[PDB]
Tab-separated table of C-alpha atoms in Angstrom:
chain	number	residue	atom	x	y	z
A	6	UNK	CA	-18.912	-13.309	-24.125
A	7	UNK	CA	-16.169	-11.346	-22.383
A	8	UNK	CA	-18.637	-10.154	-19.739
A	9	UNK	CA	-19.441	-13.760	-18.864
A	10	UNK	CA	-15.760	-14.783	-18.776
A	11	UNK	CA	-14.903	-11.841	-16.487
A	12	UNK	CA	-17.663	-12.765	-14.050
A	13	UNK	CA	-16.622	-16.413	-14.222
A	14	UNK	CA	-13.033	-15.301	-13.560
A	15	UNK	CA	-14.068	-13.213	-10.540
A	16	UNK	CA	-16.126	-16.124	-9.270
A	17	UNK	CA	-13.464	-18.807	-9.703
A	18	UNK	CA	-10.149	-16.955	-9.322
A	19	UNK	CA	-10.419	-13.477	-7.851
A	20	UNK	CA	-12.799	-13.874	-4.903
A	21	UNK	CA	-11.254	-15.148	-1.655
A	22	UNK	CA	-13.277	-17.644	0.447
A	23	UNK	CA	-14.761	-15.877	3.492
A	24	UNK	CA	-13.128	-18.483	5.735
A	25	UNK	CA	-9.619	-17.947	4.377
A	26	UNK	CA	-9.942	-14.178	4.902
A	27	UNK	CA	-11.056	-14.854	8.448
A	28	UNK	CA	-7.982	-16.936	9.315
A	29	UNK	CA	-5.609	-14.352	7.825
A	30	UNK	CA	-7.312	-11.544	9.740
A	31	UNK	CA	-7.209	-13.476	12.974
A	32	UNK	CA	-3.515	-14.208	12.459
A	33	UNK	CA	-2.945	-10.473	12.010
A	34	UNK	CA	-4.925	-9.457	15.114
A	35	UNK	CA	-3.064	-12.101	17.133
A	36	UNK	CA	0.252	-10.630	15.915
A	37	UNK	CA	-0.867	-7.035	16.438
A	38	UNK	CA	-1.956	-7.777	20.000
A	39	UNK	CA	1.395	-9.370	20.813
A	40	UNK	CA	3.276	-6.363	19.460
A	41	UNK	CA	1.068	-3.981	21.461
A	42	UNK	CA	1.720	-5.945	24.651
A	43	UNK	CA	5.461	-5.846	24.116
A	44	UNK	CA	5.386	-2.141	23.280
A	45	UNK	CA	3.228	-1.207	26.276
A	46	UNK	CA	5.551	-3.333	28.430
A	47	UNK	CA	9.078	-2.561	27.161
A	48	UNK	CA	8.576	0.855	25.525
A	49	UNK	CA	5.745	2.445	27.563
A	50	UNK	CA	7.329	5.901	27.191
A	51	UNK	CA	7.200	5.749	23.376
A	52	UNK	CA	4.264	7.986	22.353
A	53	UNK	CA	2.133	5.920	19.971
A	54	UNK	CA	-1.528	5.999	19.020
A	55	UNK	CA	-3.570	2.799	18.754
A	56	UNK	CA	-2.031	0.388	16.258
A	57	UNK	CA	-4.506	-0.809	13.671
A	58	UNK	CA	-4.584	-3.276	10.801
A	59	UNK	CA	-5.031	-1.819	7.336
A	60	UNK	CA	-4.891	-2.718	3.671
A	61	UNK	CA	-7.057	-4.211	0.930
A	62	UNK	CA	-8.166	-7.123	3.104
A	63	UNK	CA	-10.123	-4.724	5.338
A	64	UNK	CA	-11.683	-2.805	2.425
A	65	UNK	CA	-12.958	-5.879	0.544
A	66	UNK	CA	-10.358	-5.265	-2.197
A	67	UNK	CA	-7.898	-8.143	-1.701
A	68	UNK	CA	-7.959	-10.908	-4.341
A	69	UNK	CA	-6.878	-14.499	-5.082
A	70	UNK	CA	-5.477	-15.209	-1.621
A	71	UNK	CA	-5.402	-13.445	1.747
A	72	UNK	CA	-1.655	-12.900	1.904
A	73	UNK	CA	-0.968	-9.222	2.610
A	74	UNK	CA	-1.792	-7.030	5.627
A	75	UNK	CA	-0.459	-3.656	6.870
A	76	UNK	CA	0.001	-2.937	10.552
A	77	UNK	CA	-0.008	0.835	11.051
A	78	UNK	CA	2.049	2.044	14.028
A	79	UNK	CA	1.187	5.725	14.342
A	80	UNK	CA	3.675	7.992	16.141
A	81	UNK	CA	2.255	10.705	18.387
A	82	UNK	CA	3.961	13.986	17.530
A	83	UNK	CA	3.205	17.178	19.505
A	84	UNK	CA	1.530	19.833	17.325
A	85	UNK	CA	3.940	22.639	18.292
A	86	UNK	CA	7.113	20.622	17.717
A	87	UNK	CA	6.747	19.092	14.258
A	88	UNK	CA	5.713	19.882	10.709
A	89	UNK	CA	5.158	17.727	7.661
A	90	UNK	CA	6.598	19.189	4.484
A	91	UNK	CA	5.395	17.891	1.089
A	92	UNK	CA	8.263	16.641	-1.061
A	93	UNK	CA	7.152	18.699	-4.051
A	94	UNK	CA	7.743	21.793	-1.865
A	95	UNK	CA	11.439	21.050	-1.273
A	96	UNK	CA	14.527	21.809	-3.317
A	97	UNK	CA	14.925	18.077	-4.015
A	98	UNK	CA	11.423	18.207	-5.547
A	99	UNK	CA	10.246	14.723	-4.666
A	100	UNK	CA	6.452	14.368	-4.982
A	101	UNK	CA	4.961	11.371	-3.175
A	102	UNK	CA	7.361	11.780	-0.264
A	103	UNK	CA	7.472	14.038	2.800
A	104	UNK	CA	9.848	15.525	5.369
A	105	UNK	CA	8.916	15.534	9.046
A	106	UNK	CA	10.702	18.544	10.505
A	107	UNK	CA	11.494	19.213	14.161
A	108	UNK	CA	10.237	22.778	14.726
A	109	UNK	CA	10.858	25.465	17.325
A	110	UNK	CA	14.041	24.024	18.848
A	111	UNK	CA	14.832	27.380	20.468
A	112	UNK	CA	11.521	27.306	22.356
A	113	UNK	CA	11.185	23.587	22.977
A	114	UNK	CA	14.759	22.305	23.042
A	115	UNK	CA	16.152	18.899	22.133
A	116	UNK	CA	14.769	16.369	24.593
A	117	UNK	CA	11.325	17.989	24.883
A	118	UNK	CA	9.955	15.123	22.783
A	119	UNK	CA	10.581	11.372	23.018
A	120	UNK	CA	11.019	11.395	19.261
A	121	UNK	CA	13.987	13.765	19.530
A	122	UNK	CA	16.103	10.612	19.899
A	123	UNK	CA	15.248	9.789	16.267
A	124	UNK	CA	16.039	13.269	14.853
A	125	UNK	CA	18.864	13.729	12.344
A	126	UNK	CA	19.709	17.172	10.976
A	127	UNK	CA	16.478	18.644	12.332
A	128	UNK	CA	14.318	15.939	10.716
A	129	UNK	CA	12.529	12.929	12.159
A	130	UNK	CA	14.524	10.258	10.314
A	131	UNK	CA	12.383	7.428	8.864
A	132	UNK	CA	15.565	5.345	8.851
A	133	UNK	CA	16.292	5.891	12.556
A	134	UNK	CA	12.623	5.389	13.431
A	135	UNK	CA	12.548	2.137	11.411
A	136	UNK	CA	15.795	0.987	13.017
A	137	UNK	CA	14.265	1.553	16.454
A	138	UNK	CA	11.306	-0.695	15.666
A	139	UNK	CA	13.535	-3.172	13.831
A	140	UNK	CA	15.426	-3.859	17.075
A	141	UNK	CA	12.060	-4.531	18.763
A	142	UNK	CA	10.352	-6.539	16.038
A	143	UNK	CA	13.394	-8.465	14.828
A	144	UNK	CA	15.632	-8.531	17.905
A	145	UNK	CA	13.552	-8.511	21.088
A	146	UNK	CA	10.304	-10.444	20.681
A	147	UNK	CA	10.353	-14.228	20.919
A	148	UNK	CA	8.629	-15.107	17.614
A	149	UNK	CA	9.430	-18.852	17.776
A	150	UNK	CA	7.748	-19.145	21.186
A	151	UNK	CA	4.790	-16.935	20.257
A	152	UNK	CA	4.123	-18.815	17.025
A	153	UNK	CA	3.985	-21.925	19.188
A	154	UNK	CA	1.290	-20.514	21.524
A	155	UNK	CA	-0.693	-19.464	18.438
A	156	UNK	CA	0.227	-22.453	16.222
A	157	UNK	CA	1.809	-20.126	13.601
A	158	UNK	CA	5.320	-19.905	12.198
A	159	UNK	CA	6.403	-16.259	12.375
A	160	UNK	CA	9.715	-14.932	11.065
A	161	UNK	CA	10.856	-11.427	10.238
A	162	UNK	CA	12.107	-11.304	6.642
A	163	UNK	CA	15.803	-10.672	5.910
A	166	UNK	CA	13.185	-5.908	5.114
A	167	UNK	CA	13.155	-6.937	8.775
A	168	UNK	CA	9.997	-4.888	9.383
A	169	UNK	CA	8.119	-7.438	7.263
A	170	UNK	CA	6.797	-10.448	9.189
A	171	UNK	CA	6.301	-13.691	7.313
A	172	UNK	CA	3.526	-15.677	8.973
A	173	UNK	CA	2.597	-19.266	8.177
A	174	UNK	CA	-0.956	-19.528	9.528
A	175	UNK	CA	-1.948	-22.684	7.636
A	176	UNK	CA	0.024	-25.623	6.177
A	177	UNK	CA	0.600	-23.806	2.897
A	178	UNK	CA	-1.093	-20.456	3.469
A	179	UNK	CA	1.248	-17.553	4.069
A	180	UNK	CA	0.584	-14.037	5.189
A	181	UNK	CA	2.902	-11.073	4.975
A	182	UNK	CA	2.404	-8.378	7.615
A	183	UNK	CA	4.114	-5.048	6.977
A	184	UNK	CA	4.971	-3.284	10.219
A	185	UNK	CA	4.751	0.407	9.218
A	186	UNK	CA	5.926	3.088	11.607
A	187	UNK	CA	3.706	5.991	10.542
A	188	UNK	CA	2.712	9.634	10.882
A	189	UNK	CA	-0.961	9.912	10.074
A	190	UNK	CA	-1.880	12.985	8.116
A	191	UNK	CA	-5.648	13.207	7.795
A	192	UNK	CA	-6.778	10.938	4.958
A	193	UNK	CA	-3.135	10.111	4.178
A	194	UNK	CA	-0.337	8.287	5.983
A	195	UNK	CA	3.403	8.928	6.050
A	196	UNK	CA	5.350	5.675	6.271
A	197	UNK	CA	8.976	4.638	6.813
A	198	UNK	CA	9.359	2.680	3.568
A	199	UNK	CA	12.361	4.059	1.619
A	200	UNK	CA	12.149	5.400	-1.941
A	201	UNK	CA	13.540	3.014	-4.552
A	202	UNK	CA	16.452	5.398	-5.153
A	203	UNK	CA	19.061	5.607	-2.394
A	204	UNK	CA	19.451	9.397	-2.460
A	205	UNK	CA	15.773	9.715	-1.481
A	206	UNK	CA	15.964	7.877	1.868
A	207	UNK	CA	15.498	10.597	4.538
A	208	UNK	CA	12.001	11.048	3.108
A	209	UNK	CA	8.854	9.491	4.507
A	210	UNK	CA	6.720	7.798	1.846
A	211	UNK	CA	3.223	9.201	1.335
A	212	UNK	CA	0.394	6.671	1.228
A	213	UNK	CA	-2.769	7.873	-0.465
A	214	UNK	CA	-4.457	4.468	-0.024
A	215	UNK	CA	-7.179	5.488	2.444
A	216	UNK	CA	-8.260	8.479	0.367
A	217	UNK	CA	-8.045	6.557	-2.948
A	218	UNK	CA	-10.111	3.730	-1.453
A	219	UNK	CA	-12.707	6.108	-0.029
A	220	UNK	CA	-13.033	7.957	-3.346
A	221	UNK	CA	-13.540	4.667	-5.236
A	222	UNK	CA	-16.148	3.470	-2.769
A	223	UNK	CA	-17.963	6.836	-2.909
A	224	UNK	CA	-18.065	6.679	-6.723
A	225	UNK	CA	-19.597	3.212	-6.784
A	226	UNK	CA	-21.975	4.105	-3.973
A	227	UNK	CA	-23.390	7.048	-5.909
A	228	UNK	CA	-24.402	4.947	-8.933
A	229	UNK	CA	-24.146	1.351	-7.672
A	230	UNK	CA	-21.419	0.953	-10.277
A	231	UNK	CA	-18.843	-1.685	-11.193
A	232	UNK	CA	-15.594	0.240	-10.618
A	233	UNK	CA	-14.560	-1.760	-7.569
A	234	UNK	CA	-15.381	-5.066	-9.291
A	235	UNK	CA	-13.388	-4.023	-12.361
A	236	UNK	CA	-10.501	-3.091	-10.051
A	237	UNK	CA	-10.537	-6.444	-8.273
A	238	UNK	CA	-10.470	-8.328	-11.593
A	239	UNK	CA	-7.520	-6.182	-12.713
A	240	UNK	CA	-5.722	-6.809	-9.430
A	241	UNK	CA	-6.230	-10.568	-9.746
A	242	UNK	CA	-4.888	-10.661	-13.302
A	243	UNK	CA	-1.742	-8.744	-12.318
A	244	UNK	CA	-1.328	-10.900	-9.225
A	245	UNK	CA	-1.720	-14.112	-11.266
A	246	UNK	CA	0.463	-13.038	-14.208
A	247	UNK	CA	4.251	-12.822	-13.607
A	248	UNK	CA	4.843	-10.271	-16.385
A	249	UNK	CA	2.216	-7.997	-14.788
A	250	UNK	CA	3.450	-8.218	-11.179
A	251	UNK	CA	4.954	-4.709	-11.065
A	252	UNK	CA	1.511	-3.144	-11.385
A	253	UNK	CA	0.343	-2.124	-7.919
A	254	UNK	CA	-3.093	-1.826	-6.337
A	255	UNK	CA	-2.604	1.941	-6.242
A	256	UNK	CA	-1.696	2.238	-9.900
A	257	UNK	CA	-4.689	0.151	-10.970
A	258	UNK	CA	-6.996	2.061	-8.601
A	259	UNK	CA	-5.872	5.326	-10.177
A	260	UNK	CA	-6.452	4.125	-13.757
A	261	UNK	CA	-10.044	3.443	-12.672
A	262	UNK	CA	-10.294	6.799	-10.864
A	263	UNK	CA	-9.165	8.676	-14.004
A	264	UNK	CA	-11.438	6.576	-16.185
A	265	UNK	CA	-14.252	7.407	-13.761
A	266	UNK	CA	-13.622	11.096	-14.545
A	267	UNK	CA	-13.985	10.492	-18.316
A	268	UNK	CA	-16.794	7.941	-18.398
A	269	UNK	CA	-20.079	8.114	-16.507
A	270	UNK	CA	-21.509	4.663	-17.298
A	271	UNK	CA	-20.425	1.918	-14.919
A	272	UNK	CA	-23.638	-0.087	-14.768
A	273	UNK	CA	-23.106	-3.842	-14.169
A	274	UNK	CA	-23.675	-4.686	-17.864
A	275	UNK	CA	-20.852	-2.294	-18.843
A	276	UNK	CA	-18.195	-4.206	-16.875
A	277	UNK	CA	-16.607	-5.684	-20.016
A	278	UNK	CA	-16.480	-2.363	-21.877
A	279	UNK	CA	-14.952	-0.679	-18.791
A	280	UNK	CA	-12.442	-3.514	-18.420
A	281	UNK	CA	-11.170	-3.076	-21.998
A	282	UNK	CA	-11.122	0.706	-21.570
A	283	UNK	CA	-9.009	0.194	-18.449
A	284	UNK	CA	-6.564	-2.019	-20.405
A	285	UNK	CA	-6.157	0.616	-23.152
A	286	UNK	CA	-5.912	3.340	-20.483
A	287	UNK	CA	-3.118	1.481	-18.706
A	288	UNK	CA	-1.270	1.057	-22.010
A	289	UNK	CA	-1.401	4.792	-22.764
A	290	UNK	CA	-0.106	5.655	-19.292
A	291	UNK	CA	2.710	3.128	-19.662
A	292	UNK	CA	3.573	4.552	-23.076
A	293	UNK	CA	3.910	8.045	-21.610
A	294	UNK	CA	5.785	6.707	-18.558
A	295	UNK	CA	3.450	8.783	-16.393
A	296	UNK	CA	0.387	7.820	-14.368
A	297	UNK	CA	-0.622	10.897	-12.388
A	298	UNK	CA	-2.216	10.285	-9.002
A	299	UNK	CA	-5.886	11.226	-9.400
A	300	UNK	CA	-5.711	12.759	-5.923
A	301	UNK	CA	-2.276	14.450	-6.198
A	302	UNK	CA	-1.541	15.106	-9.890
A	303	UNK	CA	2.032	16.127	-9.051
A	304	UNK	CA	2.783	12.520	-8.177
A	305	UNK	CA	3.680	10.138	-11.010
A	306	UNK	CA	2.657	6.671	-9.887
A	307	UNK	CA	5.154	5.104	-12.303
A	308	UNK	CA	8.148	7.139	-11.016
A	309	UNK	CA	9.686	4.144	-9.292
A	310	UNK	CA	9.536	1.776	-12.292
A	311	UNK	CA	12.507	1.405	-14.687
A	312	UNK	CA	12.013	1.584	-18.468
A	313	UNK	CA	12.484	-2.174	-18.827
A	314	UNK	CA	9.779	-2.777	-16.233
A	315	UNK	CA	7.463	-0.372	-18.061
A	316	UNK	CA	8.110	-1.965	-21.480
A	317	UNK	CA	7.209	-5.427	-20.115
A	318	UNK	CA	3.931	-4.154	-18.672
A	319	UNK	CA	3.004	-2.212	-21.817
A	320	UNK	CA	3.852	-4.999	-24.261
A	321	UNK	CA	2.156	-7.691	-22.211
A	322	UNK	CA	-1.065	-5.657	-22.026
A	323	UNK	CA	-0.872	-4.580	-25.665
A	324	UNK	CA	-0.435	-8.123	-27.008
A	325	UNK	CA	-3.406	-9.150	-24.834
A	326	UNK	CA	-5.865	-6.773	-26.522
A	327	UNK	CA	-6.144	-9.133	-29.509
A	328	UNK	CA	-7.587	-11.752	-27.116
A	329	UNK	CA	-8.235	-10.375	-23.601
A	330	UNK	CA	-9.333	-13.816	-22.357
A	331	UNK	CA	-5.696	-14.924	-22.169
A	332	UNK	CA	-5.385	-12.623	-19.141
A	333	UNK	CA	-8.011	-14.664	-17.353
A	334	UNK	CA	-5.428	-17.478	-17.150
A	335	UNK	CA	-6.466	-19.128	-20.396
């Protein structure tokens, strides 16, 4: 049965050994700690909150291999000096992105804030902020030496704010160094829009709120939404034609489906899985996957039509024998 194959697939492909997760996490904390020491030592005047590790590996949602970790570097911005403007509220009309505006310059003039050195045209520039950290992360810290003390091989990617870490002979971990402005249950990040004319905008991450909503849903009925998600994530991670599908997009298909369908008991996993495949296909066909948390945001807005066709056709052809997705 499909149910049995899905559970076999989760068991044999999707779930990451507790020990492998441990080594990846430790590699990340080692790296974080080294960055914090450098920052506290060479940039002690840079107002930052506590850096913390984040991502699906900390929420029990990472699959196949422990290979991706976010390192959130939150800027401290004075309340009276800055505002965060939603992209959908600007002339450019760019949902999913934000402006961080320097406010009250006539009352608190240029220089009142450390972050004034990263302001361009009255806005905290994500590009200038990222450049500042790039010089630190990619130009100032001795990664060859540090990897040696920790027995890792650490290199910034060519995307210099991405650190490639070899923590085992052939186990590799990517750490994304994300300069951020935390905004409640959401995070603004310096990771440029795919289009070039949308680059002074901070990117809005809804991950923490999406994750919390998913967990709350399963907690209320002891349901299988998270398990279904993990199986979907593993399939897309293991299938080249499906690689453009992101954790967030898959999480939101489940969140919408959770609004339409109440029954996520363990024995309904297979039915939910197929419903999620057909759901995905309909979203791809429309070219629109609205964020379940911010409906103004289309989660497919950064895919091209060719990328969307490949996803849609791959999934559609699979419906005639869904088992092929389980690497069979």
